[PDB]
Design a protein around this ligand. Sequence first.
Ligand SMILES: O[C@@H]1[C@@H](O)[C@H](O)OC[C@H]1O
Length: 305
Amino acid sequence: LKLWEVFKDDFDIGAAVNVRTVDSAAELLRAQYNSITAENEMKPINTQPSEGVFTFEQADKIADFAAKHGKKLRGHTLVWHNQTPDWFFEGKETLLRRMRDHIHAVAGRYKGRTYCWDVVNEAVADGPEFIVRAFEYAHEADPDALLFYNDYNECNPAKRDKIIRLVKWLKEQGAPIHGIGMQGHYNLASPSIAEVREAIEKYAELGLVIHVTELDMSVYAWDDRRTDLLEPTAEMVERQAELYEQLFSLYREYRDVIRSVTFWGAADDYTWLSYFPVRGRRNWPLLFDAQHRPKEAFRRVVRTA
Ligand SMILES: O[C@@H]1[C@@H](O)[C@H](O)OC[C@H]1O
């Protein structure tokens, strides 16, 4: 049984990949996912290290994998506060010009393969006119791609309201924004199911597509920073499987607005949570274990459909 096929009429089932996991998880990706996202290779510093110098080799590899095996391809990401090259800042108009040049080169290179784009990533703090123009330059570079705003902690009521205020203002300035990206970086302690449902309802009221873009279920609460666990406990697996079952049952309720659910990883053998916030720690946040075998969460999730 294959995850994507189980939910094929509900939403895409995607996985984030890098230049390593696109090879090590090749068989798992070919079978269980129908959508792929480049984890880091399409980010600004990895695509244009200096002005006028573009490095597409690593992102080309991930894009070629998707095209070869008929996988959909999410674009991530065109503009991001945390990882903007230092040369970008070395006048406000020159910044606009460099943003337009970068967007056209990256969105143009993968036009016809990237069907969507996280145009602006994490603009809300845990000026605003730059976000409108980023969407304008993106729609100019690829009029066929769906343009998303992507952010985390999207179910926290404080940050959620800021996100909604930002998107409505963007819509009121004529920005060609088509969807919102719920990053879905959750854990066992937070957020609750009701907090996710309340967020999905308020995000659907804007008339945009909803993508769950980077979903994972950390076993540690953000406070927990222990490093003495090499495998998850039975209750960790059980509570993770229960939350995943309720999450995908909730996603199916909003079938009509959610069009794709992407995990930030393919299997537990590589997850970014193993290096953030605690480096050298182990985490088990996906539906397949370190051997690309289905976990208890997989069994419970497919039974929701
Ligand atoms: O690509 C970013 C990723 O590194 C992190 O895991 O969550 C936020 C994303 O934008």
